[PDB]
Amino acid sequence: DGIRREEFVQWVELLPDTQTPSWLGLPNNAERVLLTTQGVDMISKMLKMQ
Amino acid sequence: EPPPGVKANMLRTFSSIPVSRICKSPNERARLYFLLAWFHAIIQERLRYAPLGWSKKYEFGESDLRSACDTVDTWLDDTAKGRQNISPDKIPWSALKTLM
Incomplete structure (x- = not known):
């Protein structure tokens, strides 16, 4: 609840560190899918190095 | 790179x-800009989760935010000509939802 930029900014900096996917409305396990995709991407990137 | 988050x-x-x-x-207008910023953050950070989210990797960027700010500015100026605290109901909610 604010009427000026400063209140909203202080609310922004007060946000908790833990940004679960539930923030966006996505299920919290979408991070698991993202990590699996990035792991497979790392596998492929290493593989192309021959 | 922009910091994730x-x-x-x-x-x-x-x-x-500014x-x-x-x-x-x-x-x-300040709270309208805050809502605009939150919406932009939601639709730009969901972009990372391309499959589960924005099906295709769209290009929502700075120019879109500037255009949305211009829209909010113009329509709030036209709706509220003065400088009093315009009531929440009189806010052109339908205009902002439809244009964006």
């Missing part, structure tokens, strides 16, 4: 907008 995106957007453009007019 909703908070970083909102801070960057807030620092982008305070003169966010504090003038009715005192509700």
Whole structure:
């Protein structure tokens, strides 16, 4: 609840560190899918190095 | 690279907008800009989760935020000509939802 930029900014900096996917409305396990995709991407990137 | 995270995106957007453009007019323009920033952060940070989210990797960027700010500014100026705290109901909610 604010009427000026400063209140909203202080609310922004007060946000908790833990940004679960539930923030966006996505299920919290979408991070698991993202990590699996990035792991497979790392596998492929290493593989192309021959 | 831009730092991942909703908070970083909102801070960057807030620092982008000059305070003169966010504090003038009715005192509700600030909260309108905050809602715009939150919406932009949501639709730009969901972009990372391309499969589960924005099916295709769309290009929502700075120009879109500037255009949305211009729209909000013009329609709030036209709806509320003065400088009093315009009531929440009189806010052109339908105009902002439809244009965006």
